[PDB]
């Protein structure tokens, strides 16, 4: 029930190196729970995808962080 | 993008299952391939291959003519292969194919012109079948191209070492790969390299924790190519399980210590050090009571352990200890205490998270290795072999 | 014939899709298994008391 | 001249017919120099009047030269008619079924997929939400080309993924038992994108004038464009 | 229509295979449920030996 919300407000949260590891991190355990985010809506997902597509520039992240 | 091409109207796995009757059909047809960008463009046609004897059927012209609409396009793409068997519905031009003899019995046996189906049982200059260029030119052929961005090649269909390439190509998963090690240290192991691989059975614990790691894999009946495992033995050398962790991205195996048999000649127990030595990650299924110090498995790799400590009433410490240079990439202040029944989720993934970081760090110390990311070794693979077909092109002029 | 040719391409298609679940789906009958799993720890719990 | 041309190119013996491809290109090619030309495929395998004859006259340089090549495209490897006639059993598959068609440079690729609609005739029809899923893999791509239509029923051969799809919950014993006992992205089926993007998607291209352009499915204009 | 009629028989034959198959596979489980059994009867004789 703190899902919908909860990835919205992690969007909210700059891309930053000490945060890449730890959003990526519960993205991809959120990924492999499927039960959990099996209502979610169009903007869960948006959500999802914006926290982590900041995360795939080699230009700025880590080369582990844009593999993740 | 080739993933979201992929993905974005379909759930298919990134492996085609040919079928009997597409092999039976396919066998020794007529191939080609093309780069067309960066994907392998391959499309085979049938010859026939004694087909009366699937239909169970002029005697010498209906079934030649019936065949050589079928073929199969198998796209390669970074991200997998897609493959469709296919049959034409244009049929065989009555003014312009051979003009010894033309019957209508074709049209007679519509119905079973694309006679190929998903099940089936098949058996108790003059080269025959169509050209897989004509599937080809139908499909991708147009004036004005993008002169060397976008214009075909065809794959030197002639020399072995280009469909020796594609097999390459072929044997580079569409998945990413990790092979996990997996631990039981038991009371005073807490520094015996020897003991900790000398066990053959853990804590009752350990085996329920062993149960959640993914599937209980028979290693007998698993193919290699298509289960991921990381090197044990299908023959029964390292144990007639394992546990595996499977995933449209990845294939994770487990090589766990306990699982793989002690024989008595194994002396060091280099059966089952030559599996969990040679891997970046290993689960240390902690129960020595005692902290576990990294490197204790003295062989190389093994740059992160995920430390497991199970503690009283049901529960466990996750933990990483990792090597000086790796400690950039993972994050060994990790003390993550999870429950027994979600400790095999959470260490997995833990291991997974290391792995990957532990594959990158391995690219960075060995640059011309194949690339952890499985789609872009396959992506440098296709890359690599488009600018080798165009040197061998150019010193060919 | 052609209702034959019909049936014969569908169950083609039933008969992968049961070939695909067999060489991919899990086992059945799961509570047999978690209930040896709630004895077996409460039993350890028990003689890892005494 | 392009008539000649065409009867001798689809009628020559087909051993000899790619060896004319190069000799045929260069010599419209030539024609065209005297007012990305060349596209040999065999490496793969008032005043105002006369200024619109021009201009006119280069265009159908053009036009002659692009249907040459797609008449020499279409035969230079095979005999088949320039008709496609869809089979019984293509018929039984892709009736009903879901299409979209893109113009591909100066071709139209349209892929049709199988909604379980000759399935759920087969049947007589929980069932019914999964007869779709019984044929997904079935389609046709069909190529409407300056020299004719090009077509092939197709049946994907990659199983659904046992993780991300539902096929572990198909209902098979009651599908199977029911089609035997048988006698006589919420649209079902997949989208007919699917094939296209497997098989036409290019993450890059050297003009945008490369890149396929949907002809809008809800519009009655282009549908009657195409018909 | 003959060889439909073959073919049918035969793939009828492989479906009731597959469909008998899928009727038992519980079976799968009992190779991890020996490796609790041989861990929980190591752990209850540790135990009392202790």
Not at chain 3, 19 to 48: C, F, G, I, P, W
Not at chain 4, 24 to 48: C, Y
Request: include cysteine; charge should be neutral; aromatic fraction near 10%.
């Amino acid at each position: 029930k703190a899902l919908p919300v909860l990835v919205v407000k992690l969007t909210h949260i700059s891309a930053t190196a000490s945060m890449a590891v730890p959003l990526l991190e519960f993205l991809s355990t959120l990924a492999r729970l499927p039960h959990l985010y099996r209502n979610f809506a169009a903007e869960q997902y948006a959500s999802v995808f914006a926290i982590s597509l900041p995360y795939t520039n080699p230009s700025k992240f880590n080369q582990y962080i844009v593999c993740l | 993008l080739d993933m979201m091409a992929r993905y974005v109207f379909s759930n298919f796995t990134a492996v085609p299952k040919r079928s009997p009757v597409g092999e039976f059909l396919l066998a020794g047809g007529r191939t080609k391939t093309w780069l067309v960008g960066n994907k392998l463009v391959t499309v085979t046609t049938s010859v026939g291959t004694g087909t009366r004897s699937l239909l169970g059927l002029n005697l010498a012209a209906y079934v030649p003519l019936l065949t050589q609409g079928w073929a199969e396009i198998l796209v390669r793409r970074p991200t997998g292969n897609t493959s469709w068997l296919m049959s034409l519905e244009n049929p065989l031009s009555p003014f312009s194919s051979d003009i010894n003899n033309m019957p209508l019995q074709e049209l007679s046996n519509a119905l079973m012109a694309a006679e190929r189906f998903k099940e089936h049982r098949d058996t108790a200059e003059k080269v025959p079948g169509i050209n897989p260029s004509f599937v080809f030119l139908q499909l991708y052929h147009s004036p004005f191209f993008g002169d060397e961005s976008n214009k075909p090649i065809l794959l030197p269909n002639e020399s072995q070492s280009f469909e020796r390439s594609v097999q390459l190509l072929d044997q580079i998963p569409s998945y990413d790969t990790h092979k996990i090690a997996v631990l039981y240290v038991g009371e005073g192991q807490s520094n015996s390299e020897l003991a900790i691989l000398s066990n053959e059975h853990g804590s009752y614990r350990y085996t329920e924790f062993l149960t959640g790691l993914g599937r209980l894999i028979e290693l007998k009946d698993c193919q290699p190519d298509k289960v991921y495992l990381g090197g044990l033995d299908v023959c029964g050398e390292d144990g007639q399980f394992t546990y595996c962790w499977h995933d449209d991205i990845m294939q994770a195996v487990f090589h766990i210590a306990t699982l793989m048999p002690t024989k008595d000649v194994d002396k060091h127990r280099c059966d089952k050090k030559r599996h969990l030595g040679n891997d970046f990650v290993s689960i240390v299924y902690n129960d020595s009571g005692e902290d576990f110090k990294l490197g204790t498995i003295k062989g190389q790799f093994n740059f992160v352990h995920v430390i497991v400590t199970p503690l009283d009433y049901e529960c466990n410490l996750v933990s990483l200890q990792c090597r000086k240079d790796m400690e950039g990439l993972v994050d060994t202040s990790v003390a993550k205490i999870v429950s027994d029944r979600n400790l095999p989720f959470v260490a997995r993934q833990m291991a997974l998270h290391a792995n990957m970081a532990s594959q990158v760090h391995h690219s960075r110390s060995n640059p011309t290795d194949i690339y952890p990311s499985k789609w872009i070794a396959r992506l440098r693979h296709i890359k690599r072999l488009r600018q080798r077909i165009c040197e061998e092109a150019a010193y060919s002029n | 014939m052609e209702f034959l040719n019909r049936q014969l391409l569908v169950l083609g298609e039933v008969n992968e899709l049961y070939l695909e679940q067999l060489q991919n789906k899990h086992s059945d009958t799961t509570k047999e298994v978690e209930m040896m799993k709630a004895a077996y720890r409460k039993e350890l719990e028990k003689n890892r008391s005494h | 001249a392009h008539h000649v041309i065409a009867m001798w190119f689809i009628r020559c013996r087909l051993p000899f017919r790619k060896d004319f491809v190069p000799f045929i290109t260069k010599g419209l090619r030539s024609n065209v120099l005297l007012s990305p030309e060349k596209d040999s495929f065999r490496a793969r395998s008032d005043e105002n009047s006369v200024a619109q004859a021009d201009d006119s006259l280069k265009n159908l340089h053009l036009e002659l030269t692009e249907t040459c090549l797609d008449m020499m495209a279409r035969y230079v490897f095979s005999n088949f008619t320039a008709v496609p006639k869809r089979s019984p059993v293509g018929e039984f598959l892709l009736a009903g079924g879901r299409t979209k068609t893109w113009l591909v440079g100066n071709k139209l690729v349209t892929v049709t997929t199988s909604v379980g609609t000759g399935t759920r005739s087969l049947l007589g029809l929980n069932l019914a939400a999964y007869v779709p899923l019984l044929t997904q893999g079935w389609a046709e791509i069909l190529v409407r080309r300056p020299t004719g239509n090009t077509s092939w029923l197709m049946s994907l051969e990659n199983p659904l993924s046992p993780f991300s799809s539902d096929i572990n919950n198909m209902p098979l014993q009651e599908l199977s038992n029911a089609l035997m006992a048988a006698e006589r992205e919420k649209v079902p089926g997949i989208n007919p994108s699917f094939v296209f993007l497997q098989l036409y998607h290019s993450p890059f291209f050297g003009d945008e004038s490369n890149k396929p352009i949907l002809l809008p499915n809800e519009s009655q204009s282009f549908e009657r464009s195409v018909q």
